[PDB]
Design a protein around this ligand. Sequence first.
Ligand SMILES: CC1=C(/C=C/C(C)=C/C=C/C(C)=C/C=C/C=C(C)/C=C/C=C(C)/C=C/C2=C(C)C(=O)CCC2(C)C)C(C)(C)CCC1=O
Length: 158
Amino acid sequence: SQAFGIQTGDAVASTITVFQALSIDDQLAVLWYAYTEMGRSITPAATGAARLQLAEGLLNQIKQMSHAEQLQVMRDLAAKNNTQVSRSYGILSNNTKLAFWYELSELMVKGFVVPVPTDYKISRDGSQVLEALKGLDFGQQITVLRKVVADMGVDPLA
Ligand SMILES: CC1=C(/C=C/C(C)=C/C=C/C(C)=C/C=C/C=C(C)/C=C/C=C(C)/C=C/C2=C(C)C(=O)CCC2(C)C)C(C)(C)CCC1=O
């Protein structure tokens, strides 16, 4: 094991790194396909963290935009563009950020938020990241997803 100073490998840390190197479009698609692959285990009431005053208002703000505006908002989050939505997002706690993305997906399933085109093709790199995440256990999956969405938006101490 650790007797020559070697590390076998950090599956969680490495998945986070390759995810964050993806294009913005691949990031959003991979997040969506992660939701479809764990949406059963995680239950719509098992969240208990998107009905807080902070997240609820941002979700309703996005819900009212046009589909084109909604997509631009999520691209801006992933790209860390300094906009009001990105600033509001960045003051959410990390679990609230996770619950926020989960509720966006539920709103897409319900038809209130722009859907993922099923003819959007994830790139080779994106497919490799999706496969890596699907090969992690459910607990490592939570850890990766939390870090990846935690870094989105604008840092309030930026
Ligand atoms: C339109 C369009 C597109 C659209 C792309 C789009 C619209 C993409 C949208 C993607 C979205 C909104 C994905 C959401 C994913 C949510 C996940 C993985 C949530 C996991 C939650 C977890 C693990 C939470 C767990 C829990 C919670 C909640 C707690 O708080 C407590 C416990 C725990 C922490 C475990 C493209 C960009 C694709 C192409 C161009 C184009 O036109």
